[PDB]
Design a protein around this ligand. Structure first.
Ligand SMILES: CNS(=O)(=O)c1ccc(-c2cccc3ncc(-c4cc(OC)c(OC)c(OC)c4)nc23)cc1
Length: 280
């Protein structure tokens, strides 16, 4: 689980997000082109503050072992996080690319896996804070994984929420109202954002239907102010084209202004699994 920098061969840039950057590399310590391909995450620019967040992120990933969470492999130290490489990339891109070939039953299979991954985080009192299809990865056609933990926090021992306000662009169109108004993040705000993930899936990532596109439409520098007002006024993302009522109702329940009335991830998984069965 200690990887030597000299043996990591760069192949391509996989993405940037939240001050981190990820590369596809081949780890080839025998220098004979037989090593495995791995994903390598590094800081875009290493502050001492950002370095300390990165170290906690590594600890979090390392503590997670679950079929629907990307596998930690080790570190390389300019500290680098080494992970398994998932060959189908981000669910956001995969879904868009194969939309004509992925049915509702398959979306619910992915939805179910995301819920189980999230329930597992919950058991460790981890709050993901960045649930979005762009952060979900595809291992194969039957299996997705939560694939990034850059914003993930551990709840204090004595509170059910964690207050945090970072510099940078926040993904406001996936945020719960209380995250926008009070900077409070909790299992319940992860549930809110999960409802946005579910919306993303059922729109098949159609560009004009993205959460920023739909909310901007509804609002017409103070964008956060008007987003807050819209949500307090029960403005919501619409039912996606083709989305059944019972699935849209899962979304609308995740999007409760009342924090304590949102479903649990365990109940989300049950409902999804039941609807899946009914469809099969
Ligand atoms: C969305 N946030 S991010 O861009 O910083 C990011 C990028 C990569 C990963 C990541 C973390 C751990 C394992 C990964 N395995 C494969 C791919 C991946 C593979 C792709 O191709 C097969 C691809 O398409 C170019 C892609 O685009 C985002 C990501 N990405 C992996 C996590 C976050």
């Amino acid at each position: 689980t200690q990887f030597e920098e000299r043996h990591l061969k760069f192949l391509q840039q996989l993405g940037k997000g939240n001050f981190g950057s990820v590369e596809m590399c081949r780890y080839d310590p025998l220098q004979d082109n037989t090593g495995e391909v791995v994903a390598v995450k590094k800081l875009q620019h290493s502050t001492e503050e950002h370095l300390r967040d990165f170290e906690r992120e590594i600890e979090i990933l390392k503590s997670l072992q679950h079929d629907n969470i990307v596998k930690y492999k080790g570190v390389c130290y300019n500290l680098k996080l080494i992970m398994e490489y998932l060959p189908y990339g981000s669910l956001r891109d995969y879904l868009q690319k194969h939309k004509e070939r992925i049915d509702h039953i398959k979306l619910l299979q992915y939805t179910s896996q995301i819920c189980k991954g999230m329930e597992y985080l919950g058991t460790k009192r981890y709050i993901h804070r960045d649930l979005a299809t762009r952060n979900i990865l595809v291992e194969n056609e039957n299996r997705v994984k939560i694939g990034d933990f850059g914003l993930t926090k551990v709840l204090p021992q004595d509170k059910e929420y964690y207050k945090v306000k970072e510099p940078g662009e926040s993904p406001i169109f996936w945020y719960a109202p209380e995250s926008l108004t009070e900077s409070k993040f909790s299992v319940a705000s992860d549930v809110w954002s999960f409802g946005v993930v579910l919306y993303e899936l059922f729109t098949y990532i159609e560009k004009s239907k993205s959460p920023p596109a739909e909310f901007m439409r509804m609002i017409g520098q103070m964008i956060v102010f008007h987003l807050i007002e819209l949500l307090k006024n029960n403005g919501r993302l619409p039912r996606p084209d083709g989305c059944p009522d019972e699935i849209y109702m899962i979304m609308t329940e995740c999007w409760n202004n009342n924090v304590n009335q949102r479903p649990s991830f365990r109940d989300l998984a049950l409902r999804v699994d039941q609807i899946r069965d009914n469809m099969a």
